[PDB]
Amino acid sequence: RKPKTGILMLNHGGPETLGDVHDFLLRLFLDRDLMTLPIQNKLAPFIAKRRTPKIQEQYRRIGGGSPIKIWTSKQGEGMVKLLDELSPNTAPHKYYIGFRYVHPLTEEAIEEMERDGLERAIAFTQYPQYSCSTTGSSLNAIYRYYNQVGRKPTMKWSTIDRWPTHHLLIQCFADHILKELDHFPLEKRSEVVILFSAHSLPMSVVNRGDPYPQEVSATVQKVMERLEYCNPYRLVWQSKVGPMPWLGPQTDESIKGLCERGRKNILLVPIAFTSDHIETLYELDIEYSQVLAKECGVENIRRAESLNGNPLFSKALADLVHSHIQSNELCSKQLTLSCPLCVNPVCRETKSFFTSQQL
Amino acid sequence: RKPKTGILMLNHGGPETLGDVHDFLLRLFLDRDLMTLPIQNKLAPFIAKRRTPKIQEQYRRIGGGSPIKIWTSKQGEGMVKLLDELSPNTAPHKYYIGFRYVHPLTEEAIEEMERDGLERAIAFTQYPQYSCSTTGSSLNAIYRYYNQVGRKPTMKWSTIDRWPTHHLLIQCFADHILKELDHFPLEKRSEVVILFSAHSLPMSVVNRGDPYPQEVSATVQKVMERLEYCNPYRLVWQSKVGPMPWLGPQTDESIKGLCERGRKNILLVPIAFTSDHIETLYELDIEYSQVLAKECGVENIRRAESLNGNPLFSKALADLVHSHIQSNELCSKQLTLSCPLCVNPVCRETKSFFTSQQL
Ligand code: HEM
Ligand code: HEM
Ligand SMILES: C[C@H](CCC(=O)O)[C@H]1CC[C@H]2[C@@H]3[C@H](O)C[C@@H]4C[C@H](O)CC[C@]4(C)[C@H]3C[C@H](O)[C@]12C
Ligand SMILES: C[C@H](CCC(=O)O)[C@H]1CC[C@H]2[C@@H]3[C@H](O)C[C@@H]4C[C@H](O)CC[C@]4(C)[C@H]3C[C@H](O)[C@]12C
Ligand SMILES: C[C@H](CCC(=O)O)[C@H]1CC[C@H]2[C@@H]3[C@H](O)C[C@@H]4C[C@H](O)CC[C@]4(C)[C@H]3C[C@H](O)[C@]12C
Ligand SMILES: C[C@H](CCC(=O)O)[C@H]1CC[C@H]2[C@@H]3[C@H](O)C[C@@H]4C[C@H](O)CC[C@]4(C)[C@H]3C[C@H](O)[C@]12C
Ligand code: FES
Ligand code: FES
Ligand SMILES: [Cl-]
Ligand SMILES: [Cl-]
């Protein structure tokens, strides 16, 4: 029977094959929301054509593409299965995948959602900690769609735009940390240094008032509270590119640094993503734990397992939708405040769209 | 009877009267734990003489000196009053102030504590969130003291080196924030934006692994949680001095931005300090609220009152000490990890000084 409530799961692209790498980059270089370049429509097609081989090469290094869709899918099903039991008033629930930069694109998902004649649509960011350059970019795409199509939504909307401390999210991270610790030589357990590694931001974004760091930082505290401070930690940032200043310390430097100081047992915990992707399988596992770690003489370096197929995360997702629905909330309070320095007009419009929603 | 357990209360401190300003800047500028100056021993006395007028001037605009000492004193007394009741086993307790840059210097307090033959000494940072440039420097001074005097301590030492999420600390902040909201026009309560404001750090420090920003962010979350996200917020940083890059956004810049974008009801919350001082009474109340707020046409700006005399803060302090004693702890787990990139040969020495303590 007919799907009633629709859960839009938002996330950035991940090219599924080396073939999709080009269009991936192209859509990436076109997003005003994440970068203004001179004469953008002209540069992007070229920058993409230029960086395709190297990225291809990275994906090939991890087996030939991104597993983002596969994990979102399974996490999706799990969510739906549970929601259909905890919230039966919301009839059958359906999940859709709105990726920013690869198919199914956000726009395509919305088309499919409209057509299934849903009663209510929920924008569920897959980013627990809110950045304008991630969740905001995804929220903007929804608004822009309806303002490009020219008509307007035939279903009522709302957003779960952040969830950096959801209790089951935290429990998942801790569980995966505990079990990653059990694989460390028992004589070295107490001595394991934990590095929470998050995708970095450029300072120019940080300095504009982006909430990301503060949220990532909360996530980190909650986790360590639950672990009862069993090991010393730091929060470090990865994936810097370019010559500009980014928020540090860089994860590559911290690993290198810790080593030189004789802290040679390191647990990497990727705390800002809910599944594997290039950042973990290439950046962390290959560039860092295999090349870097090696030439600095680490004793042991492990990476806590991405949430991926964990059934408990699947519960987490369901529990968030459920609560969101019951609470009748349209978005978080935080969404209703733009960053005291955006130069971007759509941020207000996009937030209007969610706070102005009927019901 | 004689004092059994001493509770060393560490803080930067500030000039009590205008005359202390020169000596205050002098000791700031000679502290090779936040400053490497060419021929530092000769620039410093001078930089002091040059900056003295303007800083005196600032202190004059706030009544002619810092209250850090009065308040630390009152907190000290209340703490002791309770602790004698809470832990009679640890006999009479006595507090000492050890300021870093003004009298009573860390080193004086130490001479005194030792002169009263205490069985133990607790280094109790009054900065809830750890920075290498604040609590660390205070800890470095204790270790350095013994290395200088060339003797060993006659009392058993330990430390409460951080406490960013103490339940009562959090509770006091919540209370003070609520109290301040009832002072805003009622028609505007739930439109008020909360700007948590904290002393900034130079990126060069952030970038070497300083724990502070992540700890400050943690404190913010706990306060907002307990407030039940009743108002939008941002975490922002104040007190940038110089041409170098600091962690932003800057508090001032953020206030102006908010104003230029129609958010004209701001509550400042000083989240990284336990009492009033220059940062709050001059920077926040005068520079930002009284001047900046007029040129950018704010409607209402307000500041949550510093913890100062709050009786519940005193209870907060006692709980911390008492729990630290019951727990038998030498330091936080977090102190045992120096920040992955420091270049300061002393951090590990200090750390060892506390992790290595007898009893
Ligand atoms: C304004 C802020 C951001 C900017 C400017 C930015 C920039 C970029 C750039 C240049 C790439 C291409 C990667 C490369 O060519 O080396 C990329 C890809 C990517 N971005 Fe972001 N990023 C931002 C924030 C984030 C955050 C916080 C995340 C968290 C997951 C994220 C997720 C990803 C992922 C998974 C890729 C794959 C890129 C690749 O496979 O090479 N982005 N971004
Ligand atoms: C490397 C780290 C830091 C550096 C290099 C630094 C620099 C300075 C400077 C230059 C002054 C004198 C004011 C001036 O000369 O304009 C000062 C004083 C002061 N510091 Fe810092 N600061 C740092 C971190 C912090 C932090 C995190 C806090 C509190 C959390 C703090 C608390 C204070 C206070 C209350 C004053 C009094 C300033 C005055 O009276 O003018 N400092 N520091
Ligand atoms: C990574 C890429 C360089 C591609 C290459 O030559 O390999 C560069 C070129 C243009 C860059 C972007 C542009 O400089 C615009 C943005 C400006 C901000 O100050 C930094 C981030 C910012 C969002 C940049 C991210 C990244 O460094 C980009 C995308
Ligand atoms: C200064 C400017 C960013 C302007 C802005 O942020 O508004 C920079 C950032 C990214 C740069 C471009 C990208 O790096 C891609 C190209 C790479 C070449 O190495 C230089 C030219 C190239 C075409 C760059 C031109 C120019 O230097 C850009 C456009
Ligand atoms: C380059 C050096 C910073 C050294 C460092 O990286 O630690 C800077 C920072 C502070 C500077 C000094 C102090 O600001 C005091 C003086 C102020 C005058 O404006 C210039 C000369 C003056 C005597 C400065 C000389 C020099 O440019 C210093 C010493
Ligand atoms: C405040 C004073 C400038 C006063 C003047 O010249 O009139 C200067 C002299 C030395 C400076 C410091 C030194 O350059 C060393 C520190 C290093 C960081 O990169 C900046 C903060 C840092 C702590 C500086 C802050 C501030 O600008 C200081 C303290
Ligand atoms: S860029 Fe953060 S709200 Fe506009
Ligand atoms: S500077 Fe942080 S431990 Fe040395
Ligand atoms: Cl990926
Ligand atoms: Cl002061």
PDB file of N, CA and C in Angstrom, chain A residues 165 193 203 206-207 209 211 214 217-218 220-222 225 229-235 246-249 253-254 257-258 261 263 333-334 336-342 348, chain B residues 165 193 203 206-207 209 211 214 217-218 220-222 225 229 231-235 246-249 253-254 257-258 261 263 333-334 336-342 348:
ATOM      1  N   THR A 165      24.489  14.848  19.624  1.00  0.00           N
ATOM      2  CA  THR A 165      24.649  14.160  20.885  1.00  0.00           C
ATOM      3  C   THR A 165      23.565  13.116  21.133  1.00  0.00           C
ATOM      4  N   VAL A 193      46.280   6.242  22.789  1.00  0.00           N
ATOM      5  CA  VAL A 193      45.879   7.613  22.633  1.00  0.00           C
ATOM      6  C   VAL A 193      44.748   7.686  21.618  1.00  0.00           C
ATOM      7  N   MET A 203      39.268  28.145   7.730  1.00  0.00           N
ATOM      8  CA  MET A 203      39.050  29.171   8.737  1.00  0.00           C
ATOM      9  C   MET A 203      38.072  30.184   8.270  1.00  0.00           C
ATOM     10  N   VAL A 206      35.134  28.989   9.385  1.00  0.00           N
ATOM     11  CA  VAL A 206      35.016  28.832  10.844  1.00  0.00           C
ATOM     12  C   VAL A 206      34.733  30.222  11.429  1.00  0.00           C
ATOM     13  N   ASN A 207      35.499  31.199  10.906  1.00  0.00           N
ATOM     14  CA  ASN A 207      35.474  32.592  11.356  1.00  0.00           C
ATOM     15  C   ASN A 207      34.206  33.322  11.017  1.00  0.00           C
ATOM     16  N   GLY A 209      31.306  31.859  11.600  1.00  0.00           N
ATOM     17  CA  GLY A 209      30.371  31.420  12.634  1.00  0.00           C
ATOM     18  C   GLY A 209      29.659  30.075  12.450  1.00  0.00           C
ATOM     19  N   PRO A 211      28.628  26.537  12.958  1.00  0.00           N
ATOM     20  CA  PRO A 211      28.520  25.731  14.208  1.00  0.00           C
ATOM     21  C   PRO A 211      29.266  24.397  14.235  1.00  0.00           C
ATOM     22  N   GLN A 214      31.816  23.329  17.208  1.00  0.00           N
ATOM     23  CA  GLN A 214      31.302  23.255  18.520  1.00  0.00           C
ATOM     24  C   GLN A 214      30.445  21.987  18.625  1.00  0.00           C
ATOM     25  N   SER A 217      32.590  18.968  18.805  1.00  0.00           N
ATOM     26  CA  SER A 217      33.273  18.926  20.052  1.00  0.00           C
ATOM     27  C   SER A 217      32.423  18.350  21.150  1.00  0.00           C
ATOM     28  N   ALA A 218      31.121  18.624  21.071  1.00  0.00           N
ATOM     29  CA  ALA A 218      30.098  18.056  21.972  1.00  0.00           C
ATOM     30  C   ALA A 218      30.060  16.540  21.790  1.00  0.00           C
ATOM     31  N   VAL A 220      32.305  14.498  20.652  1.00  0.00           N
ATOM     32  CA  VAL A 220      33.467  14.045  21.380  1.00  0.00           C
ATOM     33  C   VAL A 220      33.338  13.997  22.904  1.00  0.00           C
ATOM     34  N   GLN A 221      32.804  15.033  23.560  1.00  0.00           N
ATOM     35  CA  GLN A 221      32.694  14.961  25.027  1.00  0.00           C
ATOM     36  C   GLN A 221      31.716  13.849  25.466  1.00  0.00           C
ATOM     37  N   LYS A 222      30.536  13.809  24.865  1.00  0.00           N
ATOM     38  CA  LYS A 222      29.564  12.799  25.214  1.00  0.00           C
ATOM     39  C   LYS A 222      30.133  11.400  25.149  1.00  0.00           C
ATOM     40  N   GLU A 225      32.576  10.649  27.892  1.00  0.00           N
ATOM     41  CA  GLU A 225      31.898  10.630  29.159  1.00  0.00           C
ATOM     42  C   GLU A 225      31.442   9.219  29.334  1.00  0.00           C
ATOM     43  N   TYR A 229      36.277   8.367  30.324  1.00  0.00           N
ATOM     44  CA  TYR A 229      37.650   8.898  30.236  1.00  0.00           C
ATOM     45  C   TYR A 229      38.696   7.814  30.422  1.00  0.00           C
ATOM     46  N   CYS A 230      38.369   6.603  29.986  1.00  0.00           N
ATOM     47  CA  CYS A 230      39.286   5.502  30.045  1.00  0.00           C
ATOM     48  C   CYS A 230      40.631   5.720  29.319  1.00  0.00           C
ATOM     49  N   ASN A 231      40.699   6.591  28.314  1.00  0.00           N
ATOM     50  CA  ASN A 231      41.991   6.909  27.627  1.00  0.00           C
ATOM     51  C   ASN A 231      42.143   8.398  27.357  1.00  0.00           C
ATOM     52  N   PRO A 232      43.381   8.902  27.279  1.00  0.00           N
ATOM     53  CA  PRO A 232      43.493  10.317  26.928  1.00  0.00           C
ATOM     54  C   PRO A 232      43.082  10.519  25.482  1.00  0.00           C
ATOM     55  N   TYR A 233      42.581  11.701  25.139  1.00  0.00           N
ATOM     56  CA  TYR A 233      42.210  11.952  23.749  1.00  0.00           C
ATOM     57  C   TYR A 233      42.673  13.280  23.181  1.00  0.00           C
ATOM     58  N   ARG A 234      42.573  13.430  21.868  1.00  0.00           N
ATOM     59  CA  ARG A 234      42.452  14.775  21.227  1.00  0.00           C
ATOM     60  C   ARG A 234      41.425  14.786  20.049  1.00  0.00           C
ATOM     61  N   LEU A 235      40.867  15.973  19.741  1.00  0.00           N
ATOM     62  CA  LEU A 235      40.082  16.182  18.510  1.00  0.00           C
ATOM     63  C   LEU A 235      40.965  16.831  17.428  1.00  0.00           C
ATOM     64  N   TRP A 246      43.218  26.184   7.388  1.00  0.00           N
ATOM     65  CA  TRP A 246      42.120  25.394   7.818  1.00  0.00           C
ATOM     66  C   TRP A 246      42.249  25.198   9.327  1.00  0.00           C
ATOM     67  N   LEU A 247      41.145  24.806   9.981  1.00  0.00           N
ATOM     68  CA  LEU A 247      41.179  24.459  11.372  1.00  0.00           C
ATOM     69  C   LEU A 247      42.069  23.226  11.607  1.00  0.00           C
ATOM     70  N   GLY A 248      43.002  23.354  12.530  1.00  0.00           N
ATOM     71  CA  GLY A 248      43.863  22.225  12.854  1.00  0.00           C
ATOM     72  C   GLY A 248      43.608  21.887  14.299  1.00  0.00           C
ATOM     73  N   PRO A 249      44.423  21.015  14.896  1.00  0.00           N
ATOM     74  CA  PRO A 249      45.513  20.352  14.208  1.00  0.00           C
ATOM     75  C   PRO A 249      45.071  19.354  13.148  1.00  0.00           C
ATOM     76  N   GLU A 253      49.507  15.515  10.703  1.00  0.00           N
ATOM     77  CA  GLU A 253      50.441  16.057  11.652  1.00  0.00           C
ATOM     78  C   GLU A 253      50.316  15.512  13.084  1.00  0.00           C
ATOM     79  N   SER A 254      49.126  15.187  13.555  1.00  0.00           N
ATOM     80  CA  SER A 254      49.030  14.779  14.937  1.00  0.00           C
ATOM     81  C   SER A 254      49.560  13.402  15.084  1.00  0.00           C
ATOM     82  N   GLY A 257      53.320  13.812  14.853  1.00  0.00           N
ATOM     83  CA  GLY A 257      53.691  14.401  16.118  1.00  0.00           C
ATOM     84  C   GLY A 257      53.640  13.454  17.290  1.00  0.00           C
ATOM     85  N   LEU A 258      52.516  12.789  17.495  1.00  0.00           N
ATOM     86  CA  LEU A 258      52.405  11.878  18.615  1.00  0.00           C
ATOM     87  C   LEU A 258      53.556  10.873  18.587  1.00  0.00           C
ATOM     88  N   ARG A 261      56.845  11.968  19.764  1.00  0.00           N
ATOM     89  CA  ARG A 261      56.857  12.121  21.227  1.00  0.00           C
ATOM     90  C   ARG A 261      56.725  10.813  21.986  1.00  0.00           C
ATOM     91  N   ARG A 263      54.298   8.484  21.605  1.00  0.00           N
ATOM     92  CA  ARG A 263      52.974   7.913  21.809  1.00  0.00           C
ATOM     93  C   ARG A 263      52.684   7.149  20.522  1.00  0.00           C
ATOM     94  N   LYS A 333      15.991  24.755  16.917  1.00  0.00           N
ATOM     95  CA  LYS A 333      16.145  26.115  17.297  1.00  0.00           C
ATOM     96  C   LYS A 333      17.366  26.723  16.616  1.00  0.00           C
ATOM     97  N   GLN A 334      18.480  25.991  16.609  1.00  0.00           N
ATOM     98  CA  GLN A 334      19.734  26.425  15.994  1.00  0.00           C
ATOM     99  C   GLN A 334      19.552  26.787  14.549  1.00  0.00           C
ATOM    100  N   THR A 336      17.110  28.256  13.225  1.00  0.00           N
ATOM    101  CA  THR A 336      16.481  29.566  13.192  1.00  0.00           C
ATOM    102  C   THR A 336      17.436  30.694  13.459  1.00  0.00           C
ATOM    103  N   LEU A 337      18.734  30.409  13.564  1.00  0.00           N
ATOM    104  CA  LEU A 337      19.731  31.467  13.594  1.00  0.00           C
ATOM    105  C   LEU A 337      20.826  31.213  12.577  1.00  0.00           C
ATOM    106  N   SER A 338      20.953  32.135  11.637  1.00  0.00           N
ATOM    107  CA  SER A 338      21.997  32.077  10.643  1.00  0.00           C
ATOM    108  C   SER A 338      23.310  32.458  11.259  1.00  0.00           C
ATOM    109  N   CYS A 339      24.434  32.164  10.589  1.00  0.00           N
ATOM    110  CA  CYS A 339      25.666  32.591  11.234  1.00  0.00           C
ATOM    111  C   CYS A 339      25.939  34.090  11.104  1.00  0.00           C
ATOM    112  N   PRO A 340      26.199  34.754  12.226  1.00  0.00           N
ATOM    113  CA  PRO A 340      26.353  36.214  12.242  1.00  0.00           C
ATOM    114  C   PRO A 340      27.264  36.775  11.147  1.00  0.00           C
ATOM    115  N   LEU A 341      27.729  35.958  10.219  1.00  0.00           N
ATOM    116  CA  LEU A 341      28.478  36.533   9.117  1.00  0.00           C
ATOM    117  C   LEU A 341      28.190  35.936   7.725  1.00  0.00           C
ATOM    118  N   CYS A 342      27.072  35.240   7.491  1.00  0.00           N
ATOM    119  CA  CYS A 342      26.912  34.855   6.094  1.00  0.00           C
ATOM    120  C   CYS A 342      26.661  36.045   5.220  1.00  0.00           C
ATOM    121  N   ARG A 348      18.798  32.596   4.713  1.00  0.00           N
ATOM    122  CA  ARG A 348      17.540  33.061   5.333  1.00  0.00           C
ATOM    123  C   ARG A 348      16.276  32.492   4.694  1.00  0.00           C
TER     124      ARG A 348
ATOM    125  N   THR B 165      32.766  20.308  32.576  1.00  0.00           N
ATOM    126  CA  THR B 165      31.376  19.916  32.540  1.00  0.00           C
ATOM    127  C   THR B 165      30.841  19.561  33.922  1.00  0.00           C
ATOM    128  N   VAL B 193      19.282  36.003  21.104  1.00  0.00           N
ATOM    129  CA  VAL B 193      20.377  35.135  20.687  1.00  0.00           C
ATOM    130  C   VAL B 193      21.464  35.087  21.763  1.00  0.00           C
ATOM    131  N   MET B 203      45.596  30.680  16.473  1.00  0.00           N
ATOM    132  CA  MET B 203      45.688  29.447  15.718  1.00  0.00           C
ATOM    133  C   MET B 203      46.968  28.673  15.986  1.00  0.00           C
ATOM    134  N   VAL B 206      46.033  26.720  18.860  1.00  0.00           N
ATOM    135  CA  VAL B 206      44.986  25.779  18.486  1.00  0.00           C
ATOM    136  C   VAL B 206      45.659  24.673  17.669  1.00  0.00           C
ATOM    137  N   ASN B 207      46.410  25.092  16.657  1.00  0.00           N
ATOM    138  CA  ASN B 207      47.003  24.142  15.727  1.00  0.00           C
ATOM    139  C   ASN B 207      48.047  23.152  16.268  1.00  0.00           C
ATOM    140  N   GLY B 209      47.463  21.429  19.115  1.00  0.00           N
ATOM    141  CA  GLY B 209      46.657  20.487  19.857  1.00  0.00           C
ATOM    142  C   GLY B 209      46.111  20.990  21.177  1.00  0.00           C
ATOM    143  N   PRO B 211      43.858  21.663  24.063  1.00  0.00           N
ATOM    144  CA  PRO B 211      42.584  21.076  24.445  1.00  0.00           C
ATOM    145  C   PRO B 211      41.424  22.053  24.613  1.00  0.00           C
ATOM    146  N   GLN B 214      37.894  22.578  22.392  1.00  0.00           N
ATOM    147  CA  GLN B 214      37.000  21.421  22.455  1.00  0.00           C
ATOM    148  C   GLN B 214      36.350  21.369  23.835  1.00  0.00           C
ATOM    149  N   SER B 217      33.738  24.126  24.045  1.00  0.00           N
ATOM    150  CA  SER B 217      32.556  23.732  23.285  1.00  0.00           C
ATOM    151  C   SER B 217      31.711  22.760  24.084  1.00  0.00           C
ATOM    152  N   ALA B 218      32.348  21.996  24.951  1.00  0.00           N
ATOM    153  CA  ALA B 218      31.660  20.953  25.715  1.00  0.00           C
ATOM    154  C   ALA B 218      30.796  21.602  26.768  1.00  0.00           C
ATOM    155  N   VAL B 220      29.690  24.724  26.741  1.00  0.00           N
ATOM    156  CA  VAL B 220      28.529  25.271  26.036  1.00  0.00           C
ATOM    157  C   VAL B 220      27.361  24.256  25.839  1.00  0.00           C
ATOM    158  N   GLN B 221      27.676  23.032  25.456  1.00  0.00           N
ATOM    159  CA  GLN B 221      26.627  22.116  25.104  1.00  0.00           C
ATOM    160  C   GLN B 221      25.871  21.801  26.319  1.00  0.00           C
ATOM    161  N   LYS B 222      26.576  21.448  27.407  1.00  0.00           N
ATOM    162  CA  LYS B 222      25.943  21.049  28.659  1.00  0.00           C
ATOM    163  C   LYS B 222      25.009  22.150  29.167  1.00  0.00           C
ATOM    164  N   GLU B 225      21.934  22.185  26.862  1.00  0.00           N
ATOM    165  CA  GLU B 225      21.144  21.019  27.171  1.00  0.00           C
ATOM    166  C   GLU B 225      20.288  21.266  28.357  1.00  0.00           C
ATOM    167  N   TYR B 229      17.709  24.032  25.101  1.00  0.00           N
ATOM    168  CA  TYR B 229      17.719  24.705  23.803  1.00  0.00           C
ATOM    169  C   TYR B 229      16.541  25.656  23.691  1.00  0.00           C
ATOM    170  N   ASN B 231      16.861  28.881  23.345  1.00  0.00           N
ATOM    171  CA  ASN B 231      17.205  30.071  22.500  1.00  0.00           C
ATOM    172  C   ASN B 231      18.331  29.733  21.578  1.00  0.00           C
ATOM    173  N   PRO B 232      18.336  30.288  20.340  1.00  0.00           N
ATOM    174  CA  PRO B 232      19.485  29.987  19.472  1.00  0.00           C
ATOM    175  C   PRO B 232      20.775  30.465  20.117  1.00  0.00           C
ATOM    176  N   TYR B 233      21.876  29.776  19.838  1.00  0.00           N
ATOM    177  CA  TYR B 233      23.190  30.267  20.252  1.00  0.00           C
ATOM    178  C   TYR B 233      24.315  30.211  19.196  1.00  0.00           C
ATOM    179  N   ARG B 234      25.423  30.895  19.490  1.00  0.00           N
ATOM    180  CA  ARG B 234      26.761  30.603  18.871  1.00  0.00           C
ATOM    181  C   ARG B 234      27.883  30.648  19.939  1.00  0.00           C
ATOM    182  N   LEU B 235      28.949  29.886  19.725  1.00  0.00           N
ATOM    183  CA  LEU B 235      30.184  30.051  20.516  1.00  0.00           C
ATOM    184  C   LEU B 235      31.192  30.939  19.775  1.00  0.00           C
ATOM    185  N   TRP B 246      43.762  34.253  14.850  1.00  0.00           N
ATOM    186  CA  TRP B 246      43.245  33.663  16.046  1.00  0.00           C
ATOM    187  C   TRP B 246      42.017  32.844  15.698  1.00  0.00           C
ATOM    188  N   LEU B 247      41.582  32.014  16.647  1.00  0.00           N
ATOM    189  CA  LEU B 247      40.337  31.327  16.504  1.00  0.00           C
ATOM    190  C   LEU B 247      39.209  32.348  16.557  1.00  0.00           C
ATOM    191  N   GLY B 248      38.380  32.327  15.528  1.00  0.00           N
ATOM    192  CA  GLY B 248      37.206  33.201  15.437  1.00  0.00           C
ATOM    193  C   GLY B 248      35.978  32.319  15.370  1.00  0.00           C
ATOM    194  N   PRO B 249      34.785  32.910  15.156  1.00  0.00           N
ATOM    195  CA  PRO B 249      34.574  34.340  14.934  1.00  0.00           C
ATOM    196  C   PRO B 249      34.883  35.170  16.186  1.00  0.00           C
ATOM    197  N   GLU B 253      32.967  41.447  16.144  1.00  0.00           N
ATOM    198  CA  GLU B 253      32.554  41.068  14.801  1.00  0.00           C
ATOM    199  C   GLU B 253      31.227  40.308  14.728  1.00  0.00           C
ATOM    200  N   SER B 254      31.036  39.348  15.622  1.00  0.00           N
ATOM    201  CA  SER B 254      29.795  38.608  15.648  1.00  0.00           C
ATOM    202  C   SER B 254      28.656  39.438  16.079  1.00  0.00           C
ATOM    203  N   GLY B 257      27.816  41.808  13.070  1.00  0.00           N
ATOM    204  CA  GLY B 257      27.156  40.963  12.086  1.00  0.00           C
ATOM    205  C   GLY B 257      25.718  40.679  12.455  1.00  0.00           C
ATOM    206  N   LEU B 258      25.474  40.133  13.636  1.00  0.00           N
ATOM    207  CA  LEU B 258      24.128  39.866  14.042  1.00  0.00           C
ATOM    208  C   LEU B 258      23.265  41.105  13.860  1.00  0.00           C
ATOM    209  N   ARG B 261      22.133  42.092  10.439  1.00  0.00           N
ATOM    210  CA  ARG B 261      21.246  41.054   9.859  1.00  0.00           C
ATOM    211  C   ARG B 261      19.951  40.920  10.644  1.00  0.00           C
ATOM    212  N   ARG B 263      19.378  40.672  13.980  1.00  0.00           N
ATOM    213  CA  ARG B 263      19.317  40.043  15.283  1.00  0.00           C
ATOM    214  C   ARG B 263      19.869  41.038  16.308  1.00  0.00           C
ATOM    215  N   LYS B 333      42.802  12.001  33.445  1.00  0.00           N
ATOM    216  CA  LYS B 333      43.411  11.181  32.457  1.00  0.00           C
ATOM    217  C   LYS B 333      43.993  12.078  31.373  1.00  0.00           C
ATOM    218  N   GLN B 334      43.327  13.213  31.100  1.00  0.00           N
ATOM    219  CA  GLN B 334      43.624  14.077  29.957  1.00  0.00           C
ATOM    220  C   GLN B 334      44.961  14.761  30.127  1.00  0.00           C
ATOM    221  N   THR B 336      47.662  13.448  31.215  1.00  0.00           N
ATOM    222  CA  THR B 336      48.713  12.493  30.820  1.00  0.00           C
ATOM    223  C   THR B 336      48.981  12.486  29.293  1.00  0.00           C
ATOM    224  N   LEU B 337      48.315  13.352  28.544  1.00  0.00           N
ATOM    225  CA  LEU B 337      48.681  13.436  27.149  1.00  0.00           C
ATOM    226  C   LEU B 337      49.007  14.862  26.814  1.00  0.00           C
ATOM    227  N   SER B 338      50.270  15.081  26.478  1.00  0.00           N
ATOM    228  CA  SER B 338      50.725  16.398  26.064  1.00  0.00           C
ATOM    229  C   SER B 338      50.221  16.633  24.671  1.00  0.00           C
ATOM    230  N   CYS B 339      50.117  17.885  24.256  1.00  0.00           N
ATOM    231  CA  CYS B 339      49.390  18.055  23.007  1.00  0.00           C
ATOM    232  C   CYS B 339      50.243  17.706  21.809  1.00  0.00           C
ATOM    233  N   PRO B 340      49.699  16.908  20.862  1.00  0.00           N
ATOM    234  CA  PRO B 340      50.587  16.141  19.941  1.00  0.00           C
ATOM    235  C   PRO B 340      51.729  16.922  19.279  1.00  0.00           C
ATOM    236  N   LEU B 341      51.685  18.253  19.304  1.00  0.00           N
ATOM    237  CA  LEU B 341      52.731  19.013  18.663  1.00  0.00           C
ATOM    238  C   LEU B 341      53.526  19.988  19.516  1.00  0.00           C
ATOM    239  N   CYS B 342      53.518  19.880  20.846  1.00  0.00           N
ATOM    240  CA  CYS B 342      54.231  20.907  21.567  1.00  0.00           C
ATOM    241  C   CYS B 342      55.719  20.772  21.391  1.00  0.00           C
ATOM    242  N   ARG B 348      55.975  17.699  29.602  1.00  0.00           N
ATOM    243  CA  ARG B 348      56.187  16.319  30.127  1.00  0.00           C
ATOM    244  C   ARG B 348      56.757  16.243  31.552  1.00  0.00           C
TER     245      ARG B 348
END
